[PDB]
Amino acid sequence: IQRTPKIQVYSRHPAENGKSNFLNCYVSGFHPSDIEVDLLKNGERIEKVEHSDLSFSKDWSFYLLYYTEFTPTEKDEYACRVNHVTLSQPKIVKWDRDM
Amino acid sequence: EEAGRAFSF
Amino acid sequence: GSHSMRYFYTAMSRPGRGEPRFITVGYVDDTLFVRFDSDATSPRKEPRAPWIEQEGPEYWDRETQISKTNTQTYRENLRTALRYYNQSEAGSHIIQRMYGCDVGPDGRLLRGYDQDAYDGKDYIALNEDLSSWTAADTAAQITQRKWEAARVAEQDRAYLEGLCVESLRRYLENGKETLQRADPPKTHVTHHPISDHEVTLRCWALGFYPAEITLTWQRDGEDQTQDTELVETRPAGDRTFQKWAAVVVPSGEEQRYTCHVQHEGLPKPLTLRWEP
């Protein structure tokens, strides 16, 4: 019937404070395909986040990458916020540079 | 390249 | 090496919000090369890889026409599934298709596919013989009988043995710089105390292509499947993929643990440890 998204928040390259990077949120393993994904900087929605074209795995579950340029600092906190029909409340996953 | 046409269920 | 070409359709009904959206994406191996979206301002097949950009304007018109025709077919397929499953016209539903071909190093057909799902469940699948079907239920059996009557499998077989392998061959040559280059993972083990007497060892693989990889932890040379946390392989966004595997270990025992890495880009499997 329905499958809840797996969520990973991570950078394209190893994070180095003050160095330009890409912030990624990869959602996968979900069904149906409608999903709402935001990238947050210090709790606020980053504008103009882009995403990949809708694709799916061998088990028919969907995956999408959302991404934006970002320059990490020591101070700035980042997260991904995801809602899907399977979730009561939006789910927030914090970026941790060792994950 | 894709096939010429898909098929009706 | 061995290669695949796959096309994936997703057709999504949305009662009250227009006709069902139809998206096609095409892949060689783990590289997206074309897309089509019925919700685009001017729906066309569009290139998504540089090596496909040389295909002539006739290629683009033909491929676009095919997708426009298939948008209609899959919308009809959605209406049909509603009937076969006795469902109301109020709910949103999804049909998906995957079809394509695998080839070996010599470029000959290894295996063809053409299968569909309905609301994320198997619906019908062309068998490996490229001549017969597997239907998941009595609804898909009606489609099977219709496809047997119309000799659809013969049409699939001709495509899968012909155009599918021939076009994939041309793509592999045109994109040889990238499609036929494997990038090995960049690897490292990190160490982080959880508490006084527990540490997390995390084995990292970064920057690799294609996506397929194996990462395992052993303790005194034995596999730790149950105790390993293994994330799904994830796209970096620069064509490459990432993965990690983590194990929680007693402090003082780090050297009993080895991370093992297999990837097509590696001449031999790698063994690494935490290197203080």
Count Cβ atoms within 10 A of the Cβ of residue A19 and give its class: 0-12 exposed, 13-18 middle, 19 or more buried: exposed
Q: Which CATH architecture has domain C182-272?
A: Sandwich (2.60)
Question: Does C234 contact A at CB distance below 8 Å?
Answer: yes
Partner-chain residue, chosen from C23, C37, C234, that has the shortest CB–CB distance to A8: C234
Q: Would you call B5 and C97 a contact, using CB atoms and an 8 Å cutoff? A: no
Chains with at least 3 CB pairs less than 8 angstroms from chain B: C
Q: Please, what's the b/e burial string for C110-145 (b: 16 or more CB within 10 A of its CB; e: otherwise)?
A: eebbbbbbbbbebbbbbeeebeebebbeebbebbbe
Question: Does C10 contact A at CB distance below 8 Å?
Answer: yes
Q: How far apart are CA C62 and CA C55, in angstroms?
A: 11
Q: Would you call A60 and C10 a contact, using CB atoms and an 8 Å cutoff? A: no
Task: Evaluate the omega torsion of the peptide bond into residue C47 and state whether it is cis, within 30 degrees of 0.
Answer: no
Chains with at least 3 CB pairs less than 8 angstroms from chain C: A, B
Number of Cβ within 10 Å of residue C162's Cβ equals: 13
Q: How far apart are CA C12 and CA C117, in angstroms?
A: 12
How was this entry determined?
X-ray
Q: Would you call A6 and C232 a contact, using CB atoms and an 8 Å cutoff? A: yes
What helix, strand, coil percent values describe chain B, rounded to 5? 0, 0, 100
Q: Where are the domains of chain C?
A: 1-181, 182-272
Can you give the resolution of this entry in Å? 1.8
Contact A29, A63 (CB under 8 A): yes
The top-level CATH class assigned to C1-181 is alpha beta
Q: How far apart are CA C69 and CA C62, in angstroms?
A: 11
- Domain extent, residue A89, equals 1-99
Do B and C have ≥3 inter-chain CB pairs under 8 A? yes
Q: What total of structural domains would you count in chain A?
A: 1
Do C and A have ≥3 inter-chain CB pairs under 8 A? yes
